[PDB]
């Protein structure tokens, strides 16, 4: 089955331990990032091999250490399933080292480990992540060999730095981190070398693989190269009776829940079999007569009258429809379809069938025609013969890289609710005032989350909530780890960085105090 | 509108109601019975909590709380049911008409004042709260009291007091030979007399068409899902209410019954020890998770505390241009936010100002939404929604905010890499022509849920002992015949242009 091997290269030299007052130590940030990685890997029950190598350690535990080379590098953990032991090592009994080291030796050691341990089992993808401050001397004689080995092995590489490529600094606060002028000449050379290697390996896009600890703490980037792809749903988009185009639909957006589920266990003895649940059916009589399951029958309420409706009868009279249907009911102007009416709990991205030039070109033509005419397709969607049919809207979505249809369910007449709301614009009692409107305009201007950048004449997002990981999973993993490591201990408080990432940048907060005070004084609000 | 709805069906029993002006034409009594049955069936589904009554006047037999003469209250105000529908249908056919004539009577004098008094007493009998009290008169006589002026005056005054009380009277005039005229005698009896209905009507009332139109859809009174507090700052807080203008329709839950007698049964769930068998309190049990060889133990209170970040409400964040809100970033059905004003005074003014400024600047309020206590927060965008009304001043888009949930990073799934293949301009033009051929106008309520409609039809057929269910027309089907007729050969030339000669798009 699908598998992935990841080796984490951690810098440990004393240079990383240095920090400025009011700034979190880079070692702590790297520890937090790796803790999140291991927590997700272990608590997600995914078959991903995790190994840990630290460079800069005082001791030397490395197969290639022989020959007085690649010293001060320790292969703490080889390729194996993540375990609570690794988390305990990272959190508690791992300490900074007093000796510096070159990250190129760590790269060589990681490549050797990948090559030696990969032969055992099949590995779809191989990944390396390197956390370092790039504040140590390195030799440039290994560039060609490193590039050739990486290309031959075809293993993804990610770099994490204390800074990204003036209020208080907060972890993942959607604000500047490690203010400028704090980069040394050695750090400049390290940035240049990491940029060059990333460009050579990947290219321009590779330039985006140099993340920062604060950014990585609130971006989900660490799992970008390890996340899998959901299975595809194949069908045939049919306009009439003759024209048909083979298509595959993926779930572009779907609410993410917790796979693991709690189960009740007796407090005295923590065994599943101890607790048993039984259901009994009894009549509405004084004797509380009991009946068997086979005796029960199904019925429905009909306005104070109950009509029996057997399950077999329901199946016989059930609405039967051919399954796996994706047919175009018609085409309508995009204006008619409104975002307010979208229903369902998923969005489908529909591409052409895998490795099919004819279907691909047909779907491209359909998408281009819909975009040119500014139209959408009202279609009938059915996952299978056992799924209720749905009426949805498919609209084009064209990008410089890929083009595809986007399907979202639409409501029936029953679903719609007819609620009448009193008008507010004409309400004389609640009418606003010119001063109030000006104050509200000032408040809105002071709290804009988008900046109009004139250098590119575009809109830059300051608070892109779409990229923020769900805090619930992180909180659950943190609390589970704390309970496992400390059985007798109250649950820890929410991590500070989670709150920082769940809040807007300090700039808008500090730039909207006077407008908010003006709104408060102008608008009278009293509890009633 | 708070309370229930009460409706009384006044059906005339005069000989004019029992006659066929022409062959293959149901008599006025049969038409009234059909309308009553249709209304009962529609109320069973739309709102079963309403109250319906059936009263017959002009029959020899009498049955009223006042013990009046020539008035029979067939069914007092009560919730609709299948038994009432069957009783009404018992008189549906010609044999039913004969049975009604024999058991009830015919050709008896009456007084409009007496029937209005009976209806008022029936309304007073109900102990619930009636949002609307309505009476429907099914008569085809222009001048029930033409010989005696005193009776006509008594009826007029009784109708006047009934209208003053709050009872809404409607006249469902049926076809009569000479012609029905409201202006003659019923002009002052109807609570509202439309100027249009002043001539003589030679056909049935237009309201019968609406009454006979069955509706299969659960109609629900407006109800705020939750009243929360929008917090611009720590101190600046306004009270808002959240509604679900769009909500999925689910079939009524099944009910367990005893097969032998078909009566409701009580379901009980218990937990006992496999070794002791005694009842276990919630405190006794504990929540645990297994991760390989490691077990983690937590309690219910700890599990609830796990997912708890902030108190319920809408914590306002900065504003975002509407452009940055992608239309395809849909996660959950949207909600509607409207100022409450019943919790904090002055919130309506601030809400209106915010809506106006957001519309002027074309921005949306980004907020952290926490519906209930101990629930993870989500990110939502409140986009302004100005009031929109179609012709004849009927509102279609209420004013307020539309709340749309923005998906998190984990809610998005990566798509597999696909090589992009472009289409030549000729193919794009042919598809544009095909799409233009298949142009159609879409409305939000142009389709019906086939599953729910079929379930309702089957339930009605079973309840009413019908011969067979009424097959539901599937409006969701593509009606491919019309599409083939319209497209002509366009499909063929497109396929020959784009599809290779040997493609076989079937396997």
């Amino acid at each position: 089955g699908n598998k992935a091997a990841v080796v984490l290269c951690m810098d440990v030299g004393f240079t990383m331990s240095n920090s400025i007052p009011g700034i979190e130590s880079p070692f702590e940030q790297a520890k937090k990032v790796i803790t999140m990685f291991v927590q997700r890997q272990v608590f997600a029950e995914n078959k991903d091999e995790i190994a840990l190598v630290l460079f800069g350690t005082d001791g030397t535990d490395n197969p290639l250490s022989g020959g007085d080379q690649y010293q001060n590098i320790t292969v703490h953990r080889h390729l194996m399933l993540p375990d609570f032991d690794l988390l305990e090592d990272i959190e508690s009994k791992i300490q900074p080292g007093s000796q510096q080291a070159d990250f190129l030796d760590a790269l060589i050691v990681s490549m050797d480990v990948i090559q030696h341990e990969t032969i055992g089992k099949k590995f779809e993808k191989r990944h390396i992540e390197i956390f370092t401050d790039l504040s140590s001397r390195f030799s440039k004689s290994q560039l060609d060999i490193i590039i050739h080995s990486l290309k031959k092995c075809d293993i993804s590489l990610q770099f994490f730095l204390p800074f990204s490529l003036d209020g208080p600094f907060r972890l993942g606060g959607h604000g500047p981190s490690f203010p400028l002028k704090g980069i040394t000449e050695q750090q400049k050379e390290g940035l240049e070398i990491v940029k060059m290697v990333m460009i050579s390996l990947e290219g321009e896009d590779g330039l985006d693989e140099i993340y920062s600890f604060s950014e990585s703490l609130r971006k989900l980037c660490v799992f970008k190269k390890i996340e899998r792809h959901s299975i595809h749903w194949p069908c045939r988009l049919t306009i009439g009776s003759n024209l048909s185009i083979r298509i595959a639909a993926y779930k572009s957006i779907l609410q993410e829940r917790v796979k693991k589920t709690w189960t009740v266990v007796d407090a005295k003895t923590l065994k599943k079999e101890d607790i048993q649940k039984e259901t009994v059916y009894c009549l509405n009589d004084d004797d509380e007569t009991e009946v068997l399951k086979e005796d029960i029958i199904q019925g429905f309420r009909y306005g104070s009258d109950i009509v029996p409706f057997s399950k077999v009868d329901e199946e016989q009279m059930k609405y039967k429809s051919e399954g796996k249907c994706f047919s175009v009911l018609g085409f309508c102007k995009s204006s008619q379809v409104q975002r307010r009416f979208f229903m369902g709990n998923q969005v489908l991205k529909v591409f052409a069938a895998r490795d099919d030039e004819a279907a691909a070109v047909a779907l491209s033509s359909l998408i281009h025609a819909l975009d040119d005419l500014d139209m959408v397709a009202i279609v009938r969607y059915a996952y299978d013969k056992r799924a209720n049919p749905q009426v949805g809207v498919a609209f084009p979505h064209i990008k410089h890289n890929y083009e595809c249809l986007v399907y979202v369910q639409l409501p029936f007449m029953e679903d719609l609710r007819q609620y009448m709301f009193s008008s507010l614009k004409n309400s004389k009692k609640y009418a606003p005032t010119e001063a109030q409107l000006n104050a509200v305009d000032a408040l809105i201007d002071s709290m804009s989350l988008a900046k109009k950048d004139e250098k590119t004449d575009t809109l830059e997002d300051l608070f892109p909530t779409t990229k923020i990981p769900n805090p619930r999973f992180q909180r659950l993993f943190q609390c589970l780890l704390h309970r496992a490591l400390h059985p007798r201990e109250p649950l820890p408080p929410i991590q500070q960085h989670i709150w920082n990432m769940l809040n807007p940048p300090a700039e808008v907060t500090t730039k909207s105090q006077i407008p908010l005070s003006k709104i408060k004084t102008l608008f009278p609000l009293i509890e009633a | 509108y708070s309370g229930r709805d009460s409706l009384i069906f006044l059906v005339d029993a005069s000989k004019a109601m029992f006659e066929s002006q022409s062959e293959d034409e149901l008599t006025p009594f049969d038409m009234s019975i059909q309308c009553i049955q249709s209304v009962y069936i529609s109320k069973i589904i739309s709102s079963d909590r309403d109250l319906l009554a059936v009263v017959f006047y002009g029959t020899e037999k009498d049955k009223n709380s006042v013990n009046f003469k020539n008035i029979y209250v067939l069914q007092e105000l009560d919730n609709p049911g299948a038994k009432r529908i069957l009783e009404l249908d018992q008189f549906k056919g010609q044999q039913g008409q004969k049975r009604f004539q024999d058991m009830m009577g015919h050709g008896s004098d009456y007084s409009l004042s007496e029937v209005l008094w009976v209806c008022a007493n029936l309304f007073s009998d109900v102990q619930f709260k009636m949002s609307h009290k309505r009476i429907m008169l099914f008569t085809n006589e222009d001048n029930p009291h033409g010989n005696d002026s005193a009776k006509a005056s008594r009826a007029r005054t009784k109708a006047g007091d009934l209208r003053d009380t709050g009872i809404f009277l409607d006249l469902m005039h049926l076809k009569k030979p000479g012609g029905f005229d409201i202006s003659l005698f019923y002009r002052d009896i109807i609570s509202i007399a439309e100027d249009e209905d002043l001539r003589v009507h030679f056909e049935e009332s237009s309201k019968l068409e609406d009454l006979l139109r069955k509706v299969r859809a659960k109609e629900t009174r407006k109800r705020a899902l939750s009243r929360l507090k929008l917090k611009l700052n720590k101190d600046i807080v306004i009270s808002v209410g959240i509604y679900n203008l769009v909500q999925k329709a689910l079939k009524p839950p099944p009910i367990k019954l005893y097969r032998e007698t078909n009566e409701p049964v009580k379901t009980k769930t218990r937990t006992f020890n496999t070794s002791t068998g005694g009842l276990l309190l919630p405190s006794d049990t504990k929540r645990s998770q297994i991760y390989g060889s490691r077990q983690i133990i937590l309690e219910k209170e700890e599990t609830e505390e796990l997912k708890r970040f902030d108190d319920p409400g809408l914590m306002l964040m900065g504003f975002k241009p509407l452009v940055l809100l992608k239309k395809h970033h849909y996660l959950r059905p949207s909600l509607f936010v409207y100022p409450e004003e019943s919790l904090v005074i002055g919130s309506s003014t601030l809400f209106s100002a915010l809506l106006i400024k957001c519309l002027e600047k074309e921005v949306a309020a980004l907020c952290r939404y926490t519906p209930r206590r101990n629930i993870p927060p989500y990110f939502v965008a409140l986009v302004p929604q100005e009031e929109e009304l179609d012709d004849q001043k009927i509102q279609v888009t209420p004013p307020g905010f539309q709340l749309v949930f923005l998906p998190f990073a984990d809610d998005k799934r990566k798509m597999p890499f696909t090589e992009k293949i472009m289409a030549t301009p000729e193919q794009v033009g042919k598809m544009k022509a095909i799409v233009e051929k298949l142009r159609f106008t879409y409305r939000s309520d142009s389709f019906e849920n086939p599953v729910l409609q079929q379930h309702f039809r089957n339930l009605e057929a079973l309840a009413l002992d019908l011969m067979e269910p009424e097959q539901a027309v599937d409006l969701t089907l593509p009606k491919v015949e019309a599409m083939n007729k319209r497209l002509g050969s366009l499909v063929d030339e497109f396929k020959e242009l784009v599809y290779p000669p040997d493609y076989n798009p079937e396997g």
Binding site: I378 | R221, Q392, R443, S446, F447, A482
Partner: peptide
């Protein structure tokens, strides 16, 4: 007031479902 349903007062009489009607 206009368009009110005689069965459920307070709710406008919804138009019958039409489906797809090509122009």
């Amino acid at each position: 007031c206009p368009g009110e349903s005689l069965i459920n007062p307070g709710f406008k009489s919804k138009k019958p479902a039409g489906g797809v009607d090509f122009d």
